[PDB]
Structure formats: structure tokens, C-alpha cells
Amino acid sequence: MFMINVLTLIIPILLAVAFLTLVERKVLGYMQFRKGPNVVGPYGLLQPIADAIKLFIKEPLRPATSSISMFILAPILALTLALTMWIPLPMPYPLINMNLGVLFMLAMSSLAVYSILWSGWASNSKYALIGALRAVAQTISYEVTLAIILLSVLLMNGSFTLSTLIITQEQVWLIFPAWPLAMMWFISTLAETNRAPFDLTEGESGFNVEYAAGPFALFFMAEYANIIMMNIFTTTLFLGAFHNPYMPELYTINFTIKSLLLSITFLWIRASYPRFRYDQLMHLLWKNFLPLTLALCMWHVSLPILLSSIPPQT
Amino acid sequence: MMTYIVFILSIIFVMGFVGFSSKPSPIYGGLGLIVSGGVGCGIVLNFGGSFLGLMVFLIYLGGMMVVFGYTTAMATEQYNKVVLGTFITGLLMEFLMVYYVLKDKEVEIVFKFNGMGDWVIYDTGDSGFFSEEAMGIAALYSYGTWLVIVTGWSLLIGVVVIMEITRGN
Amino acid sequence: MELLQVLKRGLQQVSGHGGLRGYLRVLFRANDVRVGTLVGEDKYGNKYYEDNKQFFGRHRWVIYTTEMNGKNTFWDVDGSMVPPEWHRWLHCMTDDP
Amino acid sequence: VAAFLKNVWAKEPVLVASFAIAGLAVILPTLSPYTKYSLMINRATPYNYPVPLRDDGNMPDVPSHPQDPQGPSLEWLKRL
Amino acid sequence: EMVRKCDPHIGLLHRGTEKLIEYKTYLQALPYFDRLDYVSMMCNEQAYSLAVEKLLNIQPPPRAQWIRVLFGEITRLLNHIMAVTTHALDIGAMTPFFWMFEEREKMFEFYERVSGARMHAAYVRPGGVHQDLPLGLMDDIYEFSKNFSLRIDELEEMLTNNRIWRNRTVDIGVVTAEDALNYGFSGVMLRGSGIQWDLRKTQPYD
Amino acid sequence: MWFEVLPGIAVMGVCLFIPGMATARIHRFSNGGREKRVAHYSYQWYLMERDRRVSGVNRYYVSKGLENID
Amino acid sequence: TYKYVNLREPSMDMKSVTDRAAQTLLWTELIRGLGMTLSYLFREPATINYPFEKGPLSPRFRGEHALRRYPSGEERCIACKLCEAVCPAQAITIEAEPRADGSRRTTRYDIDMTKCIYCGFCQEACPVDAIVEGPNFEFSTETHEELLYNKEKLLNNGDKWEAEIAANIQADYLYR
Amino acid sequence: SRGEYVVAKLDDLINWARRSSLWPMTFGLACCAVEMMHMAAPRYDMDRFGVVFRASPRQSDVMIVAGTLTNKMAPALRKVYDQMPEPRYVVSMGSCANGGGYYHYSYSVVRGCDRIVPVDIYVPGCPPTAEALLYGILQLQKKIKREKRLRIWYRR
Amino acid sequence: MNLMITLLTNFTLATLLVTIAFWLPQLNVYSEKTSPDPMGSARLPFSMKFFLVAITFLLFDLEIALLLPLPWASQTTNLNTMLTMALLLIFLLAVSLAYEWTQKGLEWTE
Ligand code: SF4
Ligand code: SF4
Ligand code: SF4
């Protein structure tokens, strides 16, 4: 009975990321005065199926890897931490109701970089190793800023429970008292998933270029699942919906619409700006984002004390 | 066999230590340490330490072992009998302890160890409307003023020391 | 509301292809369902349509025949199936069909 | 002083905003009259059991019933 | 992360064009100049035509002179659209590449309606132009250029005031005026360094 | 025109609406037609175990009311 | 006769510097770029439906080569070898001999379509308008030797595309 | 029989999947690359056919040789072709890639790219128009559609 | 037991997908390739900046771990002491950041 719940959680994730590839192509194309795929299916609805069947019957590369264990294990960890990370999400009721769901998601965010590191190490090309090192550094820096922003927002919330965020946002959204934290959180989640304008491996090498068509597809599925879930996390954290305990479908429809709009905003940001340099995004974090994060952390530590606005523990 | 779950987890824990006590390679040693850290987080999860288990996942694995493997990737350039030998030896002694303490239920090496499950020594009470370990950590600012002061000064001094000694001039 | 006008335009686009079956046929063959003034048809069965309301490039089009010279071209439409006398009109070399 | 402040507001607005927010956070609790309300809100939360005292014979301030007029009141928290 | 030496290796597109010119007549050597700079096609025809007409001691008719300059400026719009949008495409701003290439396609219709080929026209020839403008061509040129000032503004909105684009370009490749002349730089490379020089203003043609 | 991208967004919205509706319906089905009980602390778990031990069915969701007293 | 791009001195008063600080603290120009892209989303795309729709072309278009005929059946080419003398890529090979009735006609007329640069010098050097560049461009093959046209292939192309080539010549020949 | 029908339907399915998701790897050598980018423009829009724009050579299906292949360049082209996963196809676009074109008699120009790599579709022109290259891509899709790999495997 | 079941299900789906992706076209028949990147012969040179930002991340992560239990700690009774210690922790974090800023620590990876 519970395995039915697990399957109905994990199979729509794969369907959603395939049609997210389709939606990305269509929305990106319509924003630059052309169309997306509309030939393969009716309005291109059969495009992800054709792409999947094409990618699963292509000849594997078989690179001359130094180690085969890390080469196998990097997609394993990537897909596992992409799919495990969806379970404490309160939509409006979570699959696993946990006391420290935010800390759980932050722990898997910190743990997800080993796929990049092992993919960079397993490839025999040292240029791929350099690219993997740069991607790892970017991910851990924005992990730091994600942790501080999450700490301040939860200090407004008062507990690490993810379902309590619906209760604390019943009157007004948290984007109204925490819009600088909202903006910086959105940019940090953009830079976490190697999303434009923070991707580097596409510009002048990639860490996962040596993988076959299948493992590259699995890395793509993991990355796009991370993108969708991060948008859902931003929706739950800052733009919470009205929840009726007798009609959960109202909350489901509302936050689904909001997270769809946020994912469309991700694709919209992808097609508007040039790429950052590596040192420029390091400058953006360590010299611009971090001082404001520390200042707003002090402000949100002191603000409930001076306003008699301390939230309950339970 | 379910009631020995923590004990079962503990086996994998010490098994993971023989993964890196033999020292095959820094990447494989890091992988063994990652497995051992996850198993230890599960062990402390089964005792009620949820915040400390997520401290293990967030700070040990995702914070420090990431830097360890990141520095490993800048050394031990990519391309034994002793590694497999001590791995087999350690596994054999470990299963000898397992078999003996599952046979006669009371062994000793340095201290007397009991062969029952971990569930016996648990508490029968309820903590109420709070987690005791959560408020124990939360008392870091209310009670541990001196500890906070010395830890913060240590971290600041560590930052100064780290950026000083790698200048080379 | 002018969205009612858009929905009405879609409904006459559905009804202008001789029903739902013809609408789905032209949708799955041409990936396009707009109706236009029938300029004519040749001996091979290709139907040539015009619609001056569209912008330059989409104002003239052709629906290819299903069988040409004994070859089943229901799905295998070809750009070289147009005869030259209609090839001059279709490529906007002249106004007169 | 005013020339320096306008200069750093011209070159580095991010640091100016961060320092202003930090200074506000460090000087505002000492001036707002609502910190004591936070203190007695945190004091009034009943995490434990209010274990009763044995009546020796002379305790006029302690109540004999929960609904008695004696003991602390909570009308201020009800109104605020 | 810094660069201390750059060694560009060329010769991957050495077709040996100027040896093949010696074995062909002056009319046959004209389409060779179309394929040298394949985004400035009609401008390279004019440079070759002006050299042959100088040696022939003849001059083009006044109407042909105005067509060459008019199609020279359309060619300048063709190159600058390619030189800017693909410059942003390599940087990462891929979106204005598709907007301006629709305007690049409309100017390709002007080439093919006057010469017959979309890109390599072989239109400007020594002595004038090969064929006259067809009827109604200049009406379409006026209709295109009337709306084109809006298209530059849309690209200018995406890049000029954008802080990411400036950070990639504010202090990159600074060249002095004295070193630009000695290194044989010309065009925008001299012009961007503050040197007041233009061949259409200093040594004018037709 | 721009509304041709809407079938993909509709499919994605259906696929994202499915897990929440499924979780809510499974929770209501497996817990006697009501919400799944949240046990975040030991006191709530003690209450849940007391209901399970008092129901006589070894099911906590079978709530015994005032009919079970003398 | 010259203008100074990027020689602007920004104002140092409090209003302009506060506007600049608000611009770099609230991301005004990034919102401007987002608004530009969002406005460009709701425009009708310029994508045509190939092969059901074709791009616009002029009757001067130079595509596939063809050999024309007189309106009596007699072929126009009289083996004068001007096209092979003017061809810059040397794609044309001509061999000629008098036929049975004594006319000057070709016996071999090959055009190497992989050498030809599609420049139209042959159709403008022909004194009888025999060789022409037709309007066809969808003639890609699967084998290299299929792009080596002989006299028979060019005559078949002329007989296939005469009904359009004659109209194009009629519409264009006054400019020549 | 049953097996012949099953392998025929499976061959049709894999043929549709391969031909409807072509990922090209262009070679930006010369003029014909500019015309390729004009085919990728919003007017003609290769991307609506499932044919993505500027795919990586490590995951691409079809290689489009657009430009002049010189003697200094051909080993790099052969290396790129050898490092491409099967099934792979080569499209020669323009006169330079087909038979040398204008520079056929040059000392440093490979007379046709078919001497280095096997070519499936020859697109003629100088440059061939964006409609012509799109027509060549569609003809390659038709050529992939009538493949008979599983029928040959079952018959052998 | 639910979390362990979910973890095992995610892990087994991941390895099933990896095995399918790594072995399904292996049964096809193709032709092999020879054993042969800009820096194949050159050794990898060490860069101090990447290691420096790694250790800076580690130290800031440790101070983040120290700063984390503030939501639980805000419910205390010594509110003045808790506020003072929280502000002191964030102030020492900012002091470490500013000292790394001043001594050219964030150079070329700013
Ligand atoms: S178009 Fe030019 S290159 Fe082609 S056959 Fe004619 S003269 Fe030769
Ligand atoms: S120029 Fe004309 S008449 Fe002369 S040989 Fe060529 S095709 Fe024949
Ligand atoms: S075939 Fe013509 S257009 Fe293409 S690269 Fe060669 S010279 Fe340029």
C-alpha cells in the first residue's frame, strides 16, 4: 500500500522531467520568434518519447576510464539523491512526515556534489577534471549561501518541519517580509543546479562528456528533477498556498500552478542573459551575496525579539 | 532478526572502517568513509539523535569529506596484495567477534560485552512536547557562553592560520 | 470579451475541414489546420490554397496528394512533387495561378 | 563625513546596505519596548507540569484552584 | 587562470585563392572575392571592381555608383548583425541571434531579387553592375529600413545596459592608439581606440 | 501561436498534481477516512499508542467514543 | 562628422546616485531584459511550414541547369562553346560534330554539378538562350555520380521545366 | 508469420525514433556554415523537426560538412567522424564538400569530402539555400525511415 | 520502516536504470574503436586558489553548523544572552570574511 504511494511519487517525476524538456524547447523557441517541436507529435507531444527511445539504443561510448566503479556510481548517486529528495515535500501532506525536513534537504544538497566529483575523476581527460573542480566549488559556495538564507527564513518560521511552513503562511506570504532573502534564494538555487546564467561546462570542458548516451540521459533526468523540486521548494518556502484540510486538491492545484510559473521563469531567465564568468560568479557570491546574507541573518535573529513575534516551537 | 537492526548496522560500520584502514587509494578510502558516515548517521538515528545524524550528513560528509576528496583530486594521479590481505584479516576477526558474541552472549576483550540486542537498555518514558536532545543543543546560547566564545575564536584563528601558512612568503 | 471570438474562430477552423475527421487528417498530415481559399488543384491531386490575411510566406500553401505516380505519399510528402506551373505560383514568382 | 558616505553610496551600495542593516539589528532591540513582552511570552509557556505544593497552613498568595483569582494572570497576552 | 602566451595556428582554410586567380580572366576572377569574406559579399566585389576600373581608366555610370553604395550599406548591415549577434552567441546571449537573423533573411531577399543568388551575388562588376534593379525593389527596401530602427533598439535593450554583458566587455582587450597603428589595425579597431579615421570620409569613392 | 506550448504545460501540471492527490487519498483511505495522525513528539505517539491499545482492533484510527464507558 | 560614443559623465547628485544604487540593488535592467523577452514571447513566430510552404523567390533565381529548345522541337544549342570558355570552375565539357542533316550540334554536353558555383555566367554568355539556370533547388542526391549531368539529363531537365523557365525568361529578359 | 510482423513493427518503431530525433554536428568551415545558421533561423527553424541546434559531437547522430575541406583540416575531420557513436550519417552541403567546387584544382583542397568520410546525402549549391539543406535533411529522414536492420537480422 | 523502504526503492530504481542504460545497446553488434584533450601529455599544475576557496568553504560551513540551532534556541528564557551570543557568532563570521577580503584571500576566484 505504501509502495503504491512511492511509485505514484516517483513515476510522475520522470514524466514531468521528460515533458519539462519538451516545455523548455517550446517555450525557449517561442521566446526567440520561432516555434518549438510541432512535427513529431500533435504540437510535439511525442518528442520526449522519440528522444528517449533514440538515446537508449545509441551505441555506448565506452571511454577509457581510470576507474569503472566511480563511472557506474556517479549516475547511481545522482538519480538516488534526485528522487529521495522529493519525499518530505508537503503537497499538502508529505510522503514521509519528518521533524527536520529542511535539514534533510540541505544534507542531500551538500551530498549531491559527489556525482560531479566522481564523474570528473573517472574520466581520463584532465580538462574534464578541471571543469568538475570548478563546478564543485560553485556548488559548495552556493550551498553556504543557501544554508544561511534557509536558517534565517526558518528562524522566522520557528521549526525545521516543512509542513509547518503552510501554517505560518496562512495570513500572508513570506515574500512580503523576506523579499531580499527571496531574491537571493532564487539566484542561489539558480546557481546551484548549474542553470543559466551560471552554467560553465557548456562554455569554454564538460565533466560528463565521456559518459554514454544512457548515463548522460540519467544525469539529465537527475538535473531536471532537481530543477523542478527546487522550484517546488521555493514555492513552499516563500509563496505558500491556502490549505483546506477537507479539500487538499485546492492546495495541490495552487502550488502546482505556482511551481509551474517558477519553472517557466527558470527557462525565461535562461533565454535573456549572457553567461557569467567563473571569477565573476565567485565575486557575486563572496563579495556581494555573503555580506548581505550575514546582515539579513543578524536582522532576522533580532527582529522577532524586538517585536514580540517569536513563533511557537510546535 | 529485526530487533538487532542497530547491531546489524554497526557491523557495516566497522566493515566500512576496514574499507579505509587498509588504505587502498584516497578515492576508495573516501568512499569507504562515506559509507561509514552514512551508517553511523543511521545508528544515531535509531537512538533518537535526528539533529546529530543530519549534522553527520550535512557537515562531515557534505562539508569536510567533500574537501578531502576535492584535494584528493589534486593528487594521487590516476592510472594490491597488502590491502586485500589486511581487509581479509580484519573481516575474519570481525566475524569472529560476531560469531562468539552471538554464541555465548557474553564476551570480553578489554571490557565485558553483552550479546543481547540494543533494545534492552532503552527508556520506557516519554519526553513530552519536546525533544530532549533538541533543547540540549538549543541550550548552546543560553548556557554555553564560554563554549561559544572559545569555538568562535578558534574558528577565526583557524581562518587566519590557514590563509597565513599557505602564502609561502 | 474577445476570447469568445478566438474560440469561435477555432470552431470554424474545425468545421471548415469537413468535420473532425478531416481536421485530424490535416492536423496529422500538415501539422497545420488553418483554412484558406482554394486556388485550385492539379492532375496529381495536390490542392493549392491561399489566405491573404496571413503574413508573407504563409499566405500560400499546398496540401499534397495521397498517391502520386503509384507511390503512397500519405506520410511521405515531398517538396519536389509540385509541378512547375504551380511551382511558379507557390514560390511567389508571380501573382497569377 | 557626508562626502565619504555619499562616496561609498556611489561605489559600494551593497556594503553600505549591509552595514546599515547590521547596525539596525544591533541597536534596535535596546530601544524597542517589546522585548519584555517576548520575555514573558517565553516565560508563560507551560512546557512542564505545575506540580502542586503541600499546604503547610500559611500560603495566602498561592491559589487552591486553577480558576481562583490568585496566581499570575494572562490578560496582557490575551490583549497585547 | 591567466593567459601568458597566445599562438593562433591558421591555414585550415587556405584554398590558395590568389594562385587560381592568375589562371583566370578578370571576369572569371570576380566570384573569388565573394567567397573571401562570406558575410560581406558585395563589399569585396566593390573593392575588386574599383581596382580594375582604375587600371582600365574608366568610370562607372552615376546610377551604378548609387546602387553600389546603397547595396554596400545593406552589406554593412549584414556583417554587423553577424559580427554582434554571434559575438553574443559565443558569450552566451543566444536570444538576439534569432531576432536579428530574421532581418538578415529579409536582406537576403534583396540580394536574390536583384542578382539571383541569396549570398554570392556576383553583382558588382568592373564597369558598373550586371543588371538593373527590378520594379518595386526600392519600395521594399524603404519598407524594411523604416522598421529597422526598432530592431536595433531591441538588441540594444538586451545588451547595452545589461550588467552581465558589460562585465564581459568593460576592460577586455584594451589597445592603445600608438600600438594600434603599428600592428596594422584598421576599421573599428582604430575607431574604438579614439583614432579619427574612415576611408569613406578621408579617401572617398563613388 | 503562443498557446501551442500549453499542451506540454498541461501534461506537466497533471503529472505534478498526481502525487499530491495520490498521497492525500492514500492517507485518507488507510486511516479510516481521516487525516494521517502527525506524531512529531513522544506525547503524540503515546496518545496514538493509547488509542491503538484501547480500540480493541489494534487500529489507532478506530476511535472509541462515549459509548465505551459505563 | 563624428560622435563620441561612451563619453558620458554621470551626475553625482543624491537623486541620480540613489537611482543608480536602486538599479544595482533591485535589478532594474534585468527586469527590462525579462520584459523584452516576455513581450517577444507573445508575438507570432515567423516560422513557415516547410514543405507545405515555400520561401519567396524572384524569376532571376539560379538553380538547376537545363537545356532549352526552340518552339519547333529543335534544340537551341549550336555548339559555340562560349559557356565552357566563360565557366570559372571549368564545370562544362563540350564535344561537337556535324550530325546527319549537317547542322552544328553537340555530341557531349556535361556539367559537373559538384564543380559548378551556380554563378549564371553560362546563361548570360549564351547567344541563343540554350543553357539556363532553372528555378529548381530541391534536387539533392544520395550518390556523388548522380551529380554529373550529361546532355541527356540536361535535355530531360529542360523538357521537364520548360513551362516555368519560359515564363521566367519572359518576365526577366527586358532587364538584360 | 508472427515473427516477421513483430520484427517489422519493431524496425518501424526504432526507425521513427531514430529519424524523428536527429542531433546534428555541423562543421563551421566556410560560407555554407553561414547558410546553415540561416536555416536554423526562425523562418525555417530546424528545431521544430526535432533537429536541435549545435549539438555536441560526442552525442550527435549526423555530421554536416559545410565548407571547404583542406589538406590541413582533413585528419581532424576524420578524427571527429571516428569519435562519433553509431548509427551515424554524413551530409555533404555545398560544392566544396561534394567535389571541390571552385577550388577543385587547388594544391591544398581535398577534392570532395567523400575521400575521407562516407557521405549519405549530397546537397548541391554554392551555397545551397536553407530550403535546399532542409530538403536534404528531410530526404535523410526518408532514407532512415526505409531502413531494414531488424528484417535483415531475422532473415539472416 | 517507511523511509528505509523509500530509500531502497529509489536505490533499486536507480541501479535498474543504470544497468539498462549501460547494457541494453551492449548486446547490439558494432565495430570497436582505438584506445585514443588539450592537456594529454602535460601534467596537471597545482592552483592555490581552488584549495583556498575549498578551505574557506569548509570553515564557513563549520561556523554555519555552529549557527544552525537558532530556531530551537530562540524559545529560551535568557533572551538577552541568546541574542548576544547569536550576534557575536554572526559578527565573528563577518570578521573572518572581512579579514579574508583585506588580505587578498579572494583573488582571481573572488
Ligand atoms: S553557373 Fe557559372 S560555374 Fe556554373 S556552369 Fe554556369 S558558368 Fe559554370
Ligand atoms: S553558350 Fe549556348 S550555344 Fe554556346 S555552346 Fe554553350 S549552350 Fe551551346
Ligand atoms: S560551396 Fe560555395 S558557398 Fe559553400 S563553402 Fe564552397 S565556396 Fe562557399
How far does the CA of residue E124 sit from the closest CA of chain H (Å)?
18
| Gap from CA of G130 to ligand 2 centroid (Å) | 6
Looking at the partner chain, which of A294, A295, A305 has a beta carbon nearest the beta carbon of D29? A305
Q: Is the CB of residue G116 below 6 angstroms from any atom belonging to ligand 1?
A: yes
Partners for G (CB, 8 Å, 3+ pairs)? A, C, D, E, F, H
Which residues neighbour D1 within 8 Å (Cβ) at sequence distance 6 or greater?
A: none
Q: Which amino acid is at I24?
A: L
Whether I and D touch, i.e. at least 3 CB pairs below 8 A, reads as yes
Among A235, I97, E114, residue whose Cα is nearest residue G61: E114
How far does the CA of residue I96 sit from the closest CA of chain B (Å)?
6
Domain at B4-166: CATH code: 1.20.120.1200
Class of CATH domain H2-155: alpha beta
Q: Which amino acid is at I45?
A: P
Q: Which of H35, H38, H65, H68 for a ligand 3 pocket mutation test, highest count of atoms within 8 Å of Cβ? A: H68
> Any chain H CB within 8 A of the CB of G147?
yes
Are residues H41 and H78 in contact, defined by beta-carbon separation less than 8 angstroms?
Answer: no
**Chain C residues near residue G162 by CB distance under 8 angstroms:** 84
Are residues G106 and G96 in contact, defined by beta-carbon separation less than 8 angstroms?
Answer: yes
CA distances from H40 to A36, E97, G167, H24 (A): 12, 10, 32, 12
> Any chain D CB within 8 A of the CB of B129?
yes
| Gap from CA of G162 to ligand 2 centroid (Å) | 17
Q: Which protein residue has the closest C-alpha to ligand 2 atom 3? A: G77
Are residues E124 and E45 in contact, defined by beta-carbon separation less than 8 angstroms?
Answer: yes
Reduce the DSSP state of residue G58 to 3 states and report it.
coil
Are residues H124 and G145 in contact, defined by beta-carbon separation less than 8 angstroms?
Answer: no
Q: Which protein residue has the closest C-alpha to ligand 3 atom 5? A: H67
Kindly state the cell numbers that stand for A10: 516517483
Among I56, E56, F42, residue whose Cα is nearest residue A145: I56
Evaluated on CA atoms C56, C62, C63, C66, the torsion sign reads negative
Task: Name the resolution in angstroms.
Answer: 3.2
Interface of D with B in 17-56 (CB under 8 A): 47-48
Q: Which of G110, G122, G126 for a ligand 1 pocket mutation test, highest count of atoms within 8 Å of Cβ? A: G122
Do residue G41 and residue F2 have CB atoms under 8 angstroms apart?
yes
Q: Which of G113, G114, G115, G117 for a ligand 3 pocket mutation test, highest count of atoms within 8 Å of Cβ? A: G117
Reduce the DSSP state of residue C68 to 3 states and report it.
strand
Substitution target from E164, E166, E170, E172 for chain A, most A beta carbons within 10 A: E164
Do residue D42 and residue I83 have CB atoms under 8 angstroms apart?
no
> Any chain I CB within 8 A of the CB of B163?
yes
Q: Is the CB of residue G118 below 6 angstroms from any atom belonging to ligand 1?
A: yes
Instruction: Specify the pairing of strand H121-123 against strand H89-93.
Output: parallel
What's the per-residue H, E or C state across chain E? CCCCCCCCCCCCCCCCHHHHHHHCCCCCCHHHHHCCCCCCHHHHHHHHHHHHHHHHCCCCCHHHHHHHHHHHHHHHHHHHHHHHHHHHHHHCCCHHHHHHHHHHHHHHHHHHHHCCCCCCCCCEECCEECCCCCCCHHHHHHHHHHHHHHHHHHHHHHHCCCHHHHHCCCCCCCCCHHHHHHCCCCCHHHHCCCCCCCHHHHCCCC
| Gap from CA of G121 to ligand 2 centroid (Å) | 11
Place of cell 539556363: G132
CA–CA separation, H58 and H83 (whole Å): 7
**Chain G residues near residue H100 by CB distance under 8 angstroms:** 114-115
E vs I, Cβ pairs < 8 A, gives 5
The rounded Cα F23 to chain-centroid distance in angstroms is 7
Radius of gyration (Cα) for chain I, nearest Å? 25
Kindly state the cell numbers that stand for F65: 467514543
Element of type H or E holding H90: strand H89-93
CA–CA separation, A133 and A120 (whole Å): 8
CA–CA separation, B112 and C29 (whole Å): 82
> Any chain G CB within 8 A of the CB of F21?
no
Among A306, I81, I88, residue whose Cα is nearest residue B141: I81
**Chain H residues near residue G52 by CB distance under 8 angstroms:** none
Q: What dihedral do alpha carbons C17, C19, C25, C31 form, nearest 10°?
A: 50
Q: Which residues of H touch C (CB under 8 A)?
A: 43, 131, 135, 138, 142, 145
How far does the CA of residue A197 sit from the closest CA of chain I (Å)?
17
Are residues A156 and A177 in contact, defined by beta-carbon separation less than 8 angstroms?
Answer: yes
Substitution target from D26, D34, D43 for chain A, most A beta carbons within 10 A: D34
How many Cα atoms occupy the beta-carbon half-sphere of H46 within 13 Å? 27
Q: What dihedral do alpha carbons E125, E127, E129, E130 form, nearest 10°?
A: -70
Are residues G106 and G63 in contact, defined by beta-carbon separation less than 8 angstroms?
Answer: no
Instruction: Specify the pairing of strand B112-114 against strand B106-108.
Output: antiparallel
Which spans in chain D are helix H? Answer: 2-11, 13-27, 35-43, 75-79
Q: What angle do CA G70, G74, G78 make, to 5 degrees?
A: 90
Q: What is chain E's length?
A: 206
Q: Is the CB of residue H92 below 6 angstroms from any atom belonging to ligand 3?
A: no
Which residues neighbour D2 within 8 Å (Cβ) at sequence distance 6 or greater?
A: none
Which residues neighbour B94 within 8 Å (Cβ) at sequence distance 6 or greater?
A: B11, B14, B15, B18
The rounded Cα G71 to chain-centroid distance in angstroms is 28
Q: Which protein residue has the closest C-alpha to ligand 1 atom 5? A: G116
Among I9, G65, G148, residue whose Cα is nearest residue A80: I9
Interface of E with A in 140-159 (CB under 8 A): 158-159
Q: How was this structure determined?
A: cryo-EM
Residue ranges and CATH numbers for the domains of chain I are: 1-103 (1.20.58.1610)
CA distances from C60 to C38, E154, I83 (A): 10, 30, 75
CA–CA separation, A206 and C14 (whole Å): 48
Q: Which protein residue has the closest C-alpha to ligand 2 atom 4? A: G80
Q: Where are the domains of chain B?
A: 4-166
Are residues A75 and A114 in contact, defined by beta-carbon separation less than 8 angstroms?
Answer: no
Kindly state the cell numbers that stand for I91: 559578527
Substitution target from C85, C87, C89, C94 for chain G, most G beta carbons within 10 A: C87
Q: What is chain G's length?
A: 176
Q: Which of H65, H73, H91, H102 for a ligand 3 pocket mutation test, highest count of atoms within 8 Å of Cβ? A: H102
Contact residues of ligand 2, CB 6 A cut-off? G 77-83, 94, 125-126, 128, 130-131
Which spans in H58-145 are helix H? Answer: 74-82, 95-99, 130-145
- Could you write out the DSSP letters of every residue in A102-169? HHHHHHHHHHTHHHHHHHHHHSS-HHHHHHHHHHHHHHHHHHHHHHHHHHHHHHHH-SS-STHHHHTT
